[PDB]
């Protein structure tokens, strides 16, 4: 009850973050980096997935917030080879490239050196690491191309 000393003993919504029903990218401060994308590209899907899982768990151990973990679309490349004593290129192998992204935020300026050293030492063979700064173009690149909008936009041009 309001008048009583126990007023507000049942308050609980100040202990929970407010819920709001795309996302603004937070540029880092002078002493902390902004949202960082950790791309992991491998010719083998299991190695990329396994290392992406290692990076996610490592960040949890270090109390680095993982904004999102997601896969980028697979890229298939046919590998043709010039035949012996011939001018015709024949299909040799089909190689698929698999990419996984672990998006982190709030990395410290000083601790960045230690974090990067750990995640490069454990890099498996054939897996490329690319830590970039998140941009809208990266997020938009995950969405299907809209041909109708391009034609209507071309008319305006």
């Amino acid at each position: 009850y309001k008048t009583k000393p126990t007023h507000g003993i049942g308050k609980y919504k100040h202990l929970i973050k407010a819920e709001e029903p795309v996302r603004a990218i937070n540029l880092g401060t002078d002493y902390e980096y902004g949202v960082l994308n950790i791309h992991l590209t491998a010719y083998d899907m299991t190695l990329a997935e396994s290392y992406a899982q290692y990076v996610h768990n490592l960040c949890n151990s270090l109390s680095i917030k993982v904004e999102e973990s997601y896969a980028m679309p697979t890229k298939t490349i046919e590998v043709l080879q010039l035949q012996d004593q011939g001018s015709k290129m024949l299909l040799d192998s089909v190689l698929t490239t698999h990419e996984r992204v672990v998006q982190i935020s709030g990395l410290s300026a000083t601790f960045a050196e230690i974090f990067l050293e750990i995640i490069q030492s454990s890099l498996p063979e054939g897996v490329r690491l690319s830590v970039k700064e998140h941009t809208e173009e990266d997020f938009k690149g995950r969405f299907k191309a809209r041909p109708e909008l391009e034609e209507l936009l071309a008319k305006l041009k």
Binding site: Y31, I77, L82, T110
Partner: protein
Amino acid sequence: VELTFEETERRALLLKKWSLYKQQERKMERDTIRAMLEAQQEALEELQLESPKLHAEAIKRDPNLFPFEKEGPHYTPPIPNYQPPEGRYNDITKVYTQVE
């Protein structure tokens, strides 16, 4: 194919060893981060006492650190004089378009 009792027993015992082996990798990796962090923090504290201005510059973020790209180790090293076959790369990735 159903596994034999000895096979299922051998697989269970191997996994039990795997739990302890992986526990000790994490410890070595968890004691390395701690050592690095302590050394860095101790050095920075020593650098603030000696010269505060340099310490202020040291703790700032580096604009040139990212993009940071590192390829993983190879299985065998590059061959000094190896000639790869001639060929072409033809991307055959499907393009997905949203209509409506």
